[model samples]
Target: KEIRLLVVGSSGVGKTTLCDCFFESISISDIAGQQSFYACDNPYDGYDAILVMYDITELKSFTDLKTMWLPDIFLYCNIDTQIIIIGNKKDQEIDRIITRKEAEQFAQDRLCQFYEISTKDDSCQLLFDCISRDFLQCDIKIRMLMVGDQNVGKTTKFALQDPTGHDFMNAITTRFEEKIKYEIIMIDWGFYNKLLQTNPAISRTIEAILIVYDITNEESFQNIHRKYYPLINNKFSDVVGYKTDLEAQRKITMGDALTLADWLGYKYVEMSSKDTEDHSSIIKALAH
Candidate 1:
């Protein structure tokens, strides 16, 4: 028997870094901002582990602690594994206007286990051990998927510089609509649009999404991240987490994105596709 765990969070809350600390014990590029994403895990790990779903979304960027549902955190029961919602980025409390009272209250009401971590300290690994040591065993398959945008650039599309001063870039484009026989599943808004246009099931096929956006894009640049990202997480993936481009931006409400992820219940974080040497962080986060 395996533990089927799912990590969830609002956008831009360091969900990926928290996840990475568990398997690789390394650091990844992290930026301070809001984001949307959904990630699912396919339970295949040989041992029991905990899944941390965190959200850093707020209304006033890093300032609003207004009352909102903590939907980004969730849990699953299984043997040798535990599902934990990891509320990371605690080190940025100066910028964080979310009072512990409001955050803790939501978790308490959910009747689930949770912990707080931050890329700003060593708490990332500490929390992993704390929850896993006391985890209850059960029989469940933990299917996890990275909840973010359609292409997310590096993961799907990138340029392999050719010797002839040229590059070859491979991307999903529209092929993502086809069913993929792989470990993690993806739900894109374009796929959603295609589904709706095809006269297919639109309610519960694709469970949920972790809406992601490029922070530098104008007009919020939230084309495939929010409008269609969450729909993928909430509608497609049974359990979901969030991913994001959490850097260099003046638009796209970070807190609101996190709130949205929490409203739906998932983890969130920012990623830099250009950091090839640190790609492991992306994998380790999802592996957790």
Candidate 2:
């Protein structure tokens, strides 16, 4: 899904550069913040998010946004439109005329989120991620069932810590927050299978299935085909190799894991619960 962003700010406020930072092909509309340009007939229709920006080094640009652009936006844009107040040119801190506190206060008063960024240096992906999260309204909910043999770090993967089996089972009933992008309702295979046996109709609500195994345990890895594969044969699923940090003791090679995943027609991801660096690929797989 594409998000439509409308960037409006005074001339030289880095609106164009900010738009360029978006790596994805998002629908971004730019408008010059000149007084005469405001008179031109332009439709402020169908924008999911509107970025009302100002230069932190120029006090007039900040004031003009409050006096001119904001009023114009409120008049034309939808009341429910997501408005974000952006203070650009954060690199020029020495010349900054607008204080972060002041800008944040103004944004709060206007019921908008505030962000300060140096488009030249800052990684704008973080900004877009926040916007997308808010635009979608809260977390994206997913019902995912985690299936694996015992002691494969399935619970550790969700909790990010080694908890007792009972504690982890309780955690499963509640939502698991993943960096604010997804609210996953994670169910262990044993509990999920019991529930399915009793209420077969419950299977329809499961969005995705995760067939997990420990990279250090060859027996567990082999069981993916012998045990778990038949259970999730027709479901939307992915295969995961957990505990990748124990690479020195690794028993299952990446080649073998990839071969199995390809043969099963599922995406493969490897991650370590103790280390977060390998989480991006896992998140991508789950998101898909």
Instruction: Flag clash pairs in model 2.
Output: none
Instruction: List per-prediction Cα lDDT, in the order shown.
Output: 0.34, 0.52
In candidate 1, how many Å is residue 82 off? 7.8
TM-score per prediction, in order, is: 0.31, 0.42
Q: What lDDT tens digits, residue by residue, belong to model 2 across residues 3-38?
A: 555678776573677546654553454543333554
Per-residue lDDT tens digits for candidate 1, residues 120-218, read: 668866864564444421122222122344223223211233222212211111111112211223333344444333223333322223343332324
Scored against the true structure, residue 48 in model 1 reaches a CA lDDT of 44
The whole-model C-alpha lDDT of candidate 1 against the native structure comes to 0.34
